[PDB]
Amino acid sequence: HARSTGSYSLVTQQPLGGKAQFGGQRFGEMEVWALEAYGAAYTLQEMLTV
Amino acid sequence: LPVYQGETTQTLQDYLMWQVELTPFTDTDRAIATSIVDAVDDTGYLTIQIEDIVDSIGDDEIGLEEVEAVLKRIQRFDPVGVA
Amino acid sequence: KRMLQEAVDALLDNGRRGRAITGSNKRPLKSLADMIKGKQGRFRQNLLGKRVDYSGRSVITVGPYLRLHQCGLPKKMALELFKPFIYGKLELRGLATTI
Numbered sequence: 650h651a652r653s654t655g656s657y658s659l660v661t662q663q664p665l666g667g668k669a670q671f672g673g674q675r676f677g678e679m680e681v682w683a684l685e686a687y688g689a690a691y692t693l694q695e696m697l698t699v
Numbered sequence: 700l701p702v703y704q705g706e707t708t709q710t711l712q713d714y715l716m717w718q719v720e721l722t723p724f725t726d727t728d729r730a731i732a733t734s735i736v737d738a739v740d741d742t743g744y745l746t747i748q749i750e751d752i753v754d755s756i757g758d759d760e761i762g763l764e765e766v767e768a769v770l771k772r773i774q775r776f777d778p779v780g781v782a
Numbered sequence: 783k784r785m786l787q788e789a790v791d792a793l794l795d796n797g798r799r800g801r802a803i804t805g806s807n808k809r810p811l812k813s814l815a816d817m818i819k820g821k822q823g824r825f826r827q828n829l830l831g832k833r834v835d836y837s838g839r840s841v842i843t844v845g846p847y848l849r850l851h852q853c854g855l856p857k858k859m860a861l862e863l864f865k866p867f868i869y870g871k872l873e874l875r876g877l878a879t880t881i
Contacts (some may be wrong), residue, residue, distance in 0.1 A: 650838040650839045650860045651827075651836070651837075651838055651859050651863055652835055652836065652838065652862070652877045653835070653836060653862050653863055653864075653866065654865075654866075655706075656706030656707070656708075657705075657706060657721075658702050658703065658704060658705040658706060659703065659705025659706075660705055661827075661832070661859070662823045663832045663833045664706075664835060665706055665833070665847070666706060666833050668838075668839070669704070670706065672838075673833045673834050673835050673836075673837055673838055674832060674833070674834045674836075674837035674838040674839065675814070675831060675832075675833055676830045676832070676833075677830070678829045678830060678831070680830070681829070681830045686872045693788065696830070697830070700812060718881055721881050722880075722881065777881065778881075
């Protein structure tokens with residue numbers, strides 16, 4: 650399963666999720682912890698805005 | 700609560716707006732294109748006349764020829780029925 | 783007025799005071815505080831629980847070749863993630879006058 654640009658929700662405007670009509674994966678908090686362990690703050694800004 | 704998917708295309712009107720925005724258009728050109736796209740019915744025919752659009756523009760510099768050129772660029776839009 | 787005060791309390795917090803259930807379901811309702819607290823609140827899924835766009839569910843295989851500074855992305859998964867890049871290259875190369 651992959652996605653480039655599909656459909657988002659009305660509630661909180663996020664994509665659907667677990668392959669329900671071309672969804673996407675879910676990012677983890679351990680993962681953002683590890684990213685901070687890398688300290689790529691601009692990467693997190695892209696992750697939270699783009 | 701319920702599933703609340705909340706995902707649907709805006710009758711390609713959002714698709715048309717994105718495609719027009721996807722094409723390189725100037726800020727004034729983008730505004731004119733957005734105004735033209737707003738003047739789109741479900742069938743795909745413009746409700747307002749070109750003179751009505753020019754009046755809604757409210758710019759002395761805005762003319763019939765420029766509006767027609769913008770509409771013609773808008774006419775060859777992404778999906779069919781954009782006449 | 784006692785009914786009204788109880789109803790307002792249930793609207794704020796049902797789990798604390800009272801038990802409101804739906805039709806044919808005995809489960810409680812999700813009050814204005816319920817969607818704030820617990821594992822299914824706003825604060826949860828705020829910690830980047832939000833869904834990922836360019837991602838998902840690939841399987842692992844052994845790379846005897848494909849040295850460390852490399853990885854193998856299957857081609858069927860490709861052409862989707864970088865589709866905007868494909869469009870940009872196509873427009874830049876004069877291969878697609880239109881999107």
